Ligand binder design. Structure first.
Ligand SMILES: [Zn+2]
Ligand SMILES: [Zn+2]
Ligand SMILES: [Zn+2]
Ligand SMILES: [Zn+2]
Ligand SMILES: [Zn+2]
Ligand SMILES: [Zn+2]
Ligand SMILES: [Zn+2]
Ligand SMILES: [Zn+2]
Ligand SMILES: [Zn+2]
Ligand SMILES: [Zn+2]
Ligand SMILES: [Zn+2]
Ligand SMILES: [Zn+2]
Ligand SMILES: [Zn+2]
Ligand SMILES: [Zn+2]
Lengths: 129, 130, 131, 129
């Protein structure tokens, strides 16, 4: 899962959480990206089993929701680590965005346990299990 | 901003320089098993970055180049320590560290070093720079 | 204009795929140029830093600036060739000599030299000179 | 001859002109280069036979003064071409330094003839025969 794919899935999820499949043209508008690039990327996400197309548009799958939650956990876990070692809370977020999605899963899991199985990031936002 | 492929170049160049010899494009290409044209091209990017100087006698590593080698080694070894401390086998820790160590900012690596108690050696018993 | 001859080859190889409607994959570029994938990956990231390519999921795509710098080197090579033939150098030797420095000449010089030579359309080998 | 080598020779000649061999340490000072790079480079200036090292210091040879005057000629012949095509002469001087040293000899000669065998660059500096 790339950070860009992360943006798509969060966007798609906002619509699904509102009762609607995500339309290509709206993802396009909301993200500021060509409709054809959005179409191409949606097919890619469908091939990975993270979304599924229905009559009213794109819907995130259970595996899609898992990938979202996993990347949220990676972002916020690193953040806690960076804040512990003495980086300011906002700079921690920006740094974490640069490589959180690249860190092997084992490391995120062991960091989570190592940090106390922390329920929240330094910005008060929840950390999935 | 130093890739692991750049690291390999720098270490190869440094081997030749440490014996009093410019690193020849052709020998670099043979040591890394890559094409002389690719070496010539990458070397000019390493020059733009202030890490080497290309001269008549071949390529020489600069002070910033040497520093950059040392920074990556520290990053690699400091991360290994954190990984072992969170319960990862040291061989797996080494392999994992190589996948992202060169991407971590200088700020994170220095602060993490201090956070771990200024370790002097990585779990393989190899020295961590200051 | 800060674009090497080797970079030029990369960009012409990337453009061939892109002209055809697909992204240039790291390993296709590598095989076409007869070099190592790791070298192509490394060089591609430098070309992305210069804003001449964009690496996407599909592969590598040339940016507008990339296309622009391909044309600018072609213009530089061929405008210089014309100067060299007009001052008495044989065209094959002109081609070879031009390659030794064409890529180092700043934009201003090539555009002014183009005007000075009367805005020529084709080099002495009969190939087109971009504007 | 490279332009970096050319700096070395212009610095070394200045000391030789006042009547002394240039010291490795003074060369470094003047050029803002580390002494161990200057030592290494002078010894290759010696292997190319453009300088000769002695107890009082490095001295530029007939060959060394020759290579200076050649690069000078190239620089100034190129400047005239550039001013002829409409480039400001201050811009022409700086632009010329980016490639004057890399231009094959035969082009400089054909350009010199083509330009009328000029005796001055656009700034009035004389052009070596
Ligand atoms: Zn994708
Ligand atoms: Zn955050
Ligand atoms: Zn897990
Ligand atoms: Zn947060
Ligand atoms: Zn590089
Ligand atoms: Zn030299
Ligand atoms: Zn040497
Ligand atoms: Zn290791
Ligand atoms: Zn180790
Ligand atoms: Zn390049
Ligand atoms: Zn040609
Ligand atoms: Zn031609
Ligand atoms: Zn000048
Ligand atoms: Zn002048």
């Amino acid at each position: 899962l790339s950070r860009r794919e992360f943006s798509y899935l969060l966007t798609i999820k906002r619509y699904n959480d509102s009762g609607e499949g995500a339309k290509i043209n709206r993802i396009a508008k909301d993200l500021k990206i060509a409709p054809s690039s959005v179409f191409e990327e949606v097919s890619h996400l469908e091939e990975k089993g993270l979304v599924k197309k229905k009559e009213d548009g794109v819907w995130i799958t259970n595996n899609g929701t898992r990938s979202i939650n996993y990347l949220i956990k990676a972002h916020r876990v690193i953040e806690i680590l960076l804040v512990n070692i003495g980086i300011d809370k906002q700079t921690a977020c920006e740094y974490s965005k640069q490589f959180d999605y690249l860190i092997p899963e084992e490391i995120i899991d062991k960091l989570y346990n190592y940090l106390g199985k922390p329920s929240y990031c330094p910005h008060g936002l929840e950390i999935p299990l």
